[PDB]
């Protein structure tokens, strides 16, 4: 009956926990107490980008490490040129509550979405010369929280309906649907090989999905509150998750574990965005104390602070070449640090 | 710089000009978050002055108001309400005919009044069953003491105003609910946000006028607090 099924599920969970504990031999700290420190990393605001009307809720870096997309809940999607603080594009939105944006790897399309329930793909390379809504994706009974581009024709989304969805842009339908989340999924991170992706939700969990017709491969727990940011390791064998309990945690894909925790007794606000450097030594996280913190990803200690923001830092990103770190906050400002 | 860089700078300046033009409109439009319940008549209030979010744009004294009905969303709200940290007011609509679903409505004002990202945001209360409330309380089937005890130990406050003379045992019926909501909204967040109560009907006009008056008061108080006045 139902009791038997619940007992079987509890036994399976206990077996998974026991296997994880048995596989736990050495922590990250023990295998990193000997490597030399990364030193006092001191970045500075090189370019500050202004023009948005309201709070910036998401941003994404183009694959060229030069172009930027920023989403503002005035109903705007601005494409910047970070080298010359220039506004390449300014896309108005049918809705005004946008919680996510994404740049396609090719650079021909831009994703958008929010409380409107619909993922909008805009085409930046029309012959008419104006960015136009190329495809509206409906099928989500809840707010879109994060969208990512696999290629020019497939998109991956997470919504407030506790589900993720892999869409074919041409047909406009859901090629695959990922269920198994008991709360709003807020962020998802694409693997470098574009075959798997992690997704963090408000049920204090992060699940790993297989894009090519798959389901939840692994589940990762340990956060004491809602996970509202996620980012893969450059190897794709680990990922960092930020929660609003002032903790960013590192998990390893090959062991189903929590390698390290990045917390300080003097930080009590949430963590809105998380990102990684090119080499993986630095973990960057934006907090609700108007601050960005860079951490030595091997020896868990604070490496540096970027404190130029006057409101909640919402989005973070690191270029593909690791040249700079862009931070978008609620003062309608994006700042580049390197 | 090169020619194609100067032209890019010019394009950026044109984008900035258009953005300035849009910010003029954005700053002059007061965004309201319409947050009611299924039994509440919010879907009729929006129709009288007329998936995802539903935008309803109206204008009373040449001032643009933009209400946002949250539609096809889940049963949890603690996440997207952060997007409404900059709105002028939260219009909370409660149906007063249904006494049974009023404690549930009661334990939703507290989740809005006492929640962060909303301490500077005021709440406009719309009790939207006045005709239905009168119809229920004129009969004997409705019994406030039954659903809600301690109703007897309460009298109509000196500050009361039966509009068309109304009818006894009706004004007290409205004012018990009003006082309960205002007690929930009183003993917390003093000096940052205020609750404005209003008795209304679904087909009643001048509801937009009430929203206009409350927004005037909210912005007045915020502007006074910008100075060191109060």
């Amino acid at each position, epitope marked *: 009956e139902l009791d038997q099924l619940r007992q079987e599920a509890e036994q399976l969970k206990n077996q998974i926990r026991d296997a994880r504990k048995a596989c736990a031999d050495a922590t990250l700290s023990q295998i990193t107490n000997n490597i030399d420190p990364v030193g006092r990393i001191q970045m500075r605001t090189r370019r500050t980008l202004r023009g948005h009307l309201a709070k910036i809720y998401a941003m994404h870096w183009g694959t060229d490490s030069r172009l930027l997309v920023s989403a503002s809940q005035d109903g705007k999607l601005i494409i910047w040129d970070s080298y010359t603080t220039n506004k390449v594009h300014a896309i108005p939105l049918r809705s005004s509550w946008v919680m996510t944006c994404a740049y396609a790897p090719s650079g021909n399309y831009v994703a958008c979405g929010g409380l409107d329930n619909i993922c909008s793909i805009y085409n930046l390379k029309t012959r008419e*010369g104006n960015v136009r809504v190329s495809r509206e994706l409906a099928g989500h009974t809840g707010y879109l929280s994060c969208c990512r581009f696999l290629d020019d024709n497939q998109i991956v989304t997470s919504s407030g309906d506790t589900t993720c969805a892999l869409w074919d842009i041409e047909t406009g339908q859901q090629t695959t649907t990922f269920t198994g989340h008991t709360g709003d999924v807020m962020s998802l991170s694409l693997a470098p090989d574009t075959r798997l992706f992690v997704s963090g939700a408000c049920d204090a969990s992060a699940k790993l999905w297989d894009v090519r017709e798959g389901m939840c491969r692994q589940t990762f727990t340990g956060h004491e509150s809602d996970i509202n940011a996620i980012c893969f390791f450059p190897n794709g064998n680990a990922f960092a998750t930020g929660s609003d309990d002032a903790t960013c945690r590192l998990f390893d894909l090959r062991a189903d574990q929590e390698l390290m925790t990045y917390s300080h007794d003097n930080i009590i606000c949430g963590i809105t965005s998380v990102s990684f450097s090119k080499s993986g030594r630095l973990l960057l996280a934006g907090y609700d104390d108007f601050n960005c913190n860079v951490w030595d990803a091997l020896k868990a200690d604070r490496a540096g602070v970027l404190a130029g923001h006057d409101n909640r830092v919402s989005c973070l990103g690191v270029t593909d070449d690791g040249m700079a770190v862009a931070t978008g906050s609620w003062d309608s400002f994006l700042k580049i640090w390197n | 710089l090169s020619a*194609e860089d100067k032209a890019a700078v*010019e394009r950026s300046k044109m984008i900035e000009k258009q953005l300035q033009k849009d910010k003029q409109v954005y700053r002059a439009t007061h965004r309201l978050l319409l947050l009611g319940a299924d039994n509440s008549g919010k879907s009729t209030i929006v129709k009288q002055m007329r998936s995802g979010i539903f935008e309803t744009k109206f204008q009373v004294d040449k001032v643009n108001f933009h209400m946002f009905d949250v539609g096809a969303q889940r049963d949890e709200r603690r996440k997207w309400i952060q997007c409404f940290n900059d709105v002028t007011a939260i219009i909370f609509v409660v149906d007063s005919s249904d006494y049974n679903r009023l404690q549930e409505a009661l334990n939703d004002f507290k989740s809005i009044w006492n929640n962060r990202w909303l301490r500077t945001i005021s709440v406009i209360l719309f009790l939207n069953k006045q005709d239905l409330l009168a119809e229920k309380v004129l009969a004997g089937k409705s019994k406030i003491e039954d659903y809600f005890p301690e109703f007897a130990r309460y009298t109509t406050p000196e500050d009361a105003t039966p509009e068309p003379g109304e009818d006894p045992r009706v004004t007290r019926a409205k004012y018990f609910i009003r006082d309960e909501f205002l007690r929930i909204s009183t003993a917390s967040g003093d000096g940052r946000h205020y609750c404005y109560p209003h008795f209304t009907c679904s087909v009643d006009t001048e509801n937009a006028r009430r929203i206009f008056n409350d927004c005037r008061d909210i912005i007045q108080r915020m502007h006074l607090r910008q100075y060191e006045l109060l």
Partner: single-chain antibody
Amino acid sequence: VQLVESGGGLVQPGGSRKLSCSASGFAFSSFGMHWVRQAPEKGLEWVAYISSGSGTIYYADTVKGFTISRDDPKNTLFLQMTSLRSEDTAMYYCVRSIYYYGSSPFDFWGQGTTLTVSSDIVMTQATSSVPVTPGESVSISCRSSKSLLHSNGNTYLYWFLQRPGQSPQLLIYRMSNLASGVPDRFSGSGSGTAFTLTISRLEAEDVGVYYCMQHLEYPLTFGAGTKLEL
């Protein structure tokens, strides 16, 4: 995407003609416009440019004081000819060009209207009668009197194709990037002060006249014009 134009014909040396260009299926209000001249049985030359919106207008050393204006609501680019010197009896082509990062200026061209009339970086394309057979490979060379390599590492050489009885079509922009909707068999290489365009497996649709453009200094200079006689 159509960029037609009209207003030409036979004009006396009195120097009075208005000549307009109407665009359909465009974002004409957000796209820069160019007027480009081509003398009969001769090469090309750049006449005028109007930026997005307005405020950035350039002229040649010959046509200065041939005014050019825009009409965004009607999508019409206007050219006023104040003189009818006999050297201006050239076909006039509208050019659509947008300048942002990664853009492709001189993307689409209109269809020229003939009006028969009764510092300056020099582009050299010496060869003009290259004989080729179908299925072979062609290589055209253009040279720059200055260095078309700004400090930002962006070469500004443009390769255009004009088949007989047809408007020029964009082939290569910035010496390395292929235009949209052109065969992949075309390629462009260079190192500054000297560039080449290579065509592999000529398919009998590549026969025409090839032109090279600078886009460093707004006085835009054309190549001599190499013709593949086939």
